[PDB]
């Protein structure tokens, strides 16, 4: 299962370590955009898990959620924060 496979993987990692020692700036803010937008889209991860039974009210709810998110992205692009970057 998962635990057996993880134990096997970490044992192989320990074995290859054993074999290895036996043989002998600025404009990062695009990054911060990610950090917002991961948590924004994490609510969408919950919604598509049960789209069917939330139904149209959840659909209208999710439409307004991503419209706010898409309006924020257009603001980011059209300001000039999100462009060519270091």
């Amino acid at each position: 299962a998962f635990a057996i496979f993880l134990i096997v993987a970490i044992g192989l990692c320990c074995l290859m370590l054993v074999g290895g020692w036996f043989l002998g700036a600025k404009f990062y803010l695009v990054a911060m955009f990610f950090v917002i937008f991961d948590v924004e889209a994490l609510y969408l991860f919950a919604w598509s898990t049960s789209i069917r039974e939330s139904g149209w009210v959840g659909f209208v709810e999710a439409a307004i959620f991503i419209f706010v998110l898409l309006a924020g992205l257009v603001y980011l692009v059209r300001i000039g924060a999100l462009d060519w970057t270091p």
């Binding site: 990054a31 917002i36 924004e40």
Partner: protein
């Protein structure tokens, strides 16, 4: 899950002692990622399936990437070590710890007063969390979005660009 719960809690308890104790910031970042993977093990020990995976995607995988970015672009390694350890004497470290001790033991006494009533391994899947979030908690999601969008405006403003 009981031994799994215990080992993840002690790893989280210990790695947290390390991150408040250590000096090298990158080692502090590394020990706290150990803490965050330990907490996801705790969530999966308890049964919160949409929290253990959720914490690793975001909390150990989005927020701390931004922390790592700032500590390598300041290039602060090699400066402010000697006087920074001179400030933390063990006699200084003892002082506020007794302050935090008072509330910690009161909480321990307050939580030991109640009965056990041990829960079982109840599995809580994402099938109902997405239902409950967009049902009774419908307002929270939309207003929660504004919390992030507000963070975006202030982070562009305080992270304002210039000629340099």
């Amino acid at each position: 899950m009981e031994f799994a719960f215990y080992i993840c809690g002690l790893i989280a308890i210990l790695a947290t002692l390390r991150v408040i104790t250590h000096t090298n910031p990158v080692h502090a970042l590394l020990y706290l990622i150990i803490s965050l993977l330990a907490i996801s093990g705790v969530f999966f020990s308890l049964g919160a399936y949409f929290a253990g995976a959720l914490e690793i995607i975001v909390y150990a995988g989005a927020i701390m990437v931004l922390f790592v970015f700032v500590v390598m672009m300041l290039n602060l390694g090699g400066s402010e070590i000697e006087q920074e350890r001179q400030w933390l004497k063990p006699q200084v470290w003892i002082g506020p710890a007794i302050l935090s001790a008072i509330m910690l033991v009161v909480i321990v006494y307050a939580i030991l007063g109640v009965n056990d009533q041990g829960i079982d391994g109840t599995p809580i899947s994402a099938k109902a969390v997405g239902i409950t979030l967009f049902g009774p908690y419908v307002l929270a999601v939309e207003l929660a979005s504004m919390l992030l969008l507000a963070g975006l405006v202030v982070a562009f403003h305080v992270g304002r660009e210039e000629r340099a």
